Design a protein around this ligand. Structure first.
Ligand SMILES: [Ca+2]
Ligand SMILES: [Ca+2]
Ligand SMILES: [Ca+2]
Ligand SMILES: [Ca+2]
Ligand SMILES: [Zn+2]
Length: 316
């Protein structure tokens, strides 16, 4: 980890060639010194001990199939860092250039990725439901966004607060996907989910109900599974964010879209200034309204569209 900054080349999970920032000191390590206090990628070696070994490579070429998840985790963490810095003037997830650490090859056949409070963790998938999860830029940015949330609003991962937490991660993951312009859409995880099946995804922001997630508050899940429905009830907020950006008419309520850039600015302000650990959906509405008011004025179209979007999903 002390060494010379250089640039290697590899291939990602989807077979695309990319340049990655590495560090040389006997080996070439997946350590990018160009962004904050660094981006570090580790090999968990199919175990669950974390973080594992800082990724070392002998020749600075990462074309082995074992390398692919590491290349993508490392590269997409950099892209996400760039988004937050360039678009929102935020230096890493803590606002003070905290090192970003990711471990890949976590466990065996593990169909998930997560932020654990310290670092990102990516399974390889079982090869049927998922391929290695770091192949999805929206997934990577979703996870890194959990770190942002943790250092700002601190939304508890239960019930409505947790659904907001999830939605925020889906929103910014999507916004990062659009920023990188990597075949962007309003779907989540499409690039790594069900390699055997075309056109699906884990979740949809444009139409959450496509996969049985609610798209209206009256359809919210109130049981105890999934921490009280954090990945299920996120669909209500996701639909609202999609409406704010893209517009549409939903359950008879019409929303004029104000586009992705303004969506991002509103939600980022809401997240960093107004939300608290126990914020519920109703408070999110107030926060988003206040945020749009701050940025664009109380008689703006932007404020009107935020109100319409939350009315469309039944959030008062
Ligand atoms: Ca190599
Ligand atoms: Ca996409
Ligand atoms: Ca996507
Ligand atoms: Ca698929
Ligand atoms: Zn999440």
């Amino acid at each position: 980890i002390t060494g010379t900054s250089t640039v290697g080349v590899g291939r990602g999970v989807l077979g695309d060639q990319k340049n990655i920032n590495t560090t040389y000191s006997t080996y070439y390590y997946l350590q990018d010194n160009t962004r904050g206090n660094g981006i570090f990628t580790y090999d968990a070696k199919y175990r669950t001990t974390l973080p594992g070994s800082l990724w070392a490579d002998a020749d600075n070429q990462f074309f082995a199939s074992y390398d692919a998840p590491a290349v993508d985790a490392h590269y997409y963490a950099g892209v996400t860092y760039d988004y937050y810095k360039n678009v929102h003037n935020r230096l890493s997830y803590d606002g003070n250039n905290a090192a970003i650490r990711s471990s890949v090859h976590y466990s065996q056949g593990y169909n998930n990725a997560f932020w654990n409070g310290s670092q990102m963790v990516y399974g390889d998938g079982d090869g049927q439901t998922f391929i290695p999860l770091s192949g999805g830029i929206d997934v990577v940015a979703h996870e890194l966004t959990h770190a942002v949330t943790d250092y700002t609003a601190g939304l508890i991962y239960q019930n409505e607060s947790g659904a907001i937490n999830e939605a925020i991660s889906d929103i910014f993951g999507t916004l990062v996907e659009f920023y990188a312009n990597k075949n962007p859409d309003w779907e989540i995880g499409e690039d790594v989910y069900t390699p055997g099946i075309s056109g699906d995804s884990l979740r949809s922001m444009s139409d959450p109900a496509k996969y049985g997630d609610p798209d209206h508050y009256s359809k919210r899940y109130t049981g105890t599974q999934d921490n009280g429905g954090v990945h299920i009830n996120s669909g209500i907020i996701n639909k609202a964010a999609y409406l704010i950006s893209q517009g549409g008419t939903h359950y008879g309520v019409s929303v004029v879209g104000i586009g992705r850039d303004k969506l991002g600015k509103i939600f980022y302000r809401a997240l960093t200034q107004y939300l608290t650990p126990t914020s519920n959906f109703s408070q999110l509405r107030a926060a988003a309204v206040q945020s749009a008011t701050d940025l664009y004025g109380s008689t703006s179209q932007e404020v009107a569209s935020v109100k319409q979007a939350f009315d469309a999903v039944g959030v008062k």
